[PDB]
Design a protein around this ligand. Structure first.
Ligand code: A1IX4
Ligand code: CL
Length: 291
């Protein structure tokens, strides 16, 4: 369990960013590591077999905007990024979940297309394959895995921001709707802690949110928990040592450098550190420290 860092990749401030930085919750330290080959915001991060994966996003630059189908893998042992097989389609504002060593890429946009499509990556074969699409097109979708089931939460379908959510059952290759959230949320941070799927922040169509709600898979209910100290949309999120960490985002005025930590035992959020600069739209994941 020791020696794990919170990695933040990419993001957005004025333009899409190539930063890879790692935070050590045990000593407060930040490390700047190998840049992404291509700056990207709206990407997702995940970890399989100790490798950090950056999936999709968009390169926003003064010389254009390209939605990304890329899957790039970072090895902390080498501090090197390597290209992996690309997805079938570009996916900006994607969500990602891992089940049994496989990466699921969910939704996202390509130009004006809002995807319902979903695809699954097999590291052992370096191949992607499409699976059943969601019941709703979703960009800015939050994705988490609980009990080897994949959840897609909120987002924007091209016309409406969503409070709906749905669950993918891999052995049936089938999506089913679940209880909708109490709040419409696009660009929320979604993760799993204990038996619950948490949805923190986001945009409801009018304001950035500091509210946080959690879905109990047993009771099929969403319940609000303590709100964040800051309103945040397009925030990064991960879980580390039984706590939720939220990184950055946009509060309606500033791109935040704040990192907050939620303790479920006290139902409190605390400010724990600041990123090296404010940004939104980052990919976040946890893996061993580099060398
Ligand atoms: C969440 C959101 C907030 C907004 C908004 C549009 C959205 C949605 C889309 C929607 O509701 O159609 C959204 C959802 C998920 C995202 C995930 C990543 C992501 O990275 C690129 C990025 O970081 N851009 C930033 C520039 C400043 C304003 C836009 C949002 C932040 C963007 C995301 C955007 O318009 C202004 O506030
Ligand atoms: Cl964008």
């Amino acid at each position: 369990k020791v020696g794990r860092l919170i990695y933040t990749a990419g993001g957005y401030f004025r333009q899409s960013l190539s930063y890879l930085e790692a935070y050590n919750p045990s000593n407060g330290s930040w490390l700047r590591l190998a840049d992404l080959q291509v700056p990207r915001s709206g990407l997702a991060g995940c970890v399989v077999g100790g490798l950090l994966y950056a999936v999709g996003g968009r390169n926003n630059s003064p010389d254009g905007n390209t939605d990304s189908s890329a899957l790039d893998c970072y090895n902390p042992m080498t501090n090197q990024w390597s290209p992996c097989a690309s997805m079938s389609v570009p996916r900006n504002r994607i969500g990602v979940g891992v089940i049994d060593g496989h990466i699921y890429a969910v939704g996202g946009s390509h130009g004006c297309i809002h995807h319902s499509s979903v695809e699954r990556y097999e590291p052992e074969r370096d191949e992607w394959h499409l699976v059943a699409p969601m019941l709703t097109r979703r960009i800015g979708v939050g994705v988490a895995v609980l009990n080897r089931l994949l959840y897609a939460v909120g987002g924007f379908d091209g016309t409406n921001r969503l409070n709906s959510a749905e669950c993918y059952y891999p052995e049936r290759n089938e999506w089913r709707m679940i209880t909708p959230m109490n709040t419409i949320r696009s660009g929320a941070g979604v993760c799993v802690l204990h038996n619950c799927i948490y949805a923190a922040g986001g945009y409801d169509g009018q304001d950035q949110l500091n509210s946080v709600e959690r879905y109990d898979v047993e009771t099929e209910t969403w319940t609000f928990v303590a709100p964040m100290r800051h309103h945040r949309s397009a925030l990064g999120i991960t879980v580390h040592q039984g706590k939720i960490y939220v990184l950055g985002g946009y509060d309606g005025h500033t791109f935040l450098d704040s990192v907050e930590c939620y303790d479920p035992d006290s139902d409190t959020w605390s400010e724990v550190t600041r990123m090296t600069s404010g940004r939104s739209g980052v990919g976040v994941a946890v893996t061993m420290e580099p060398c």
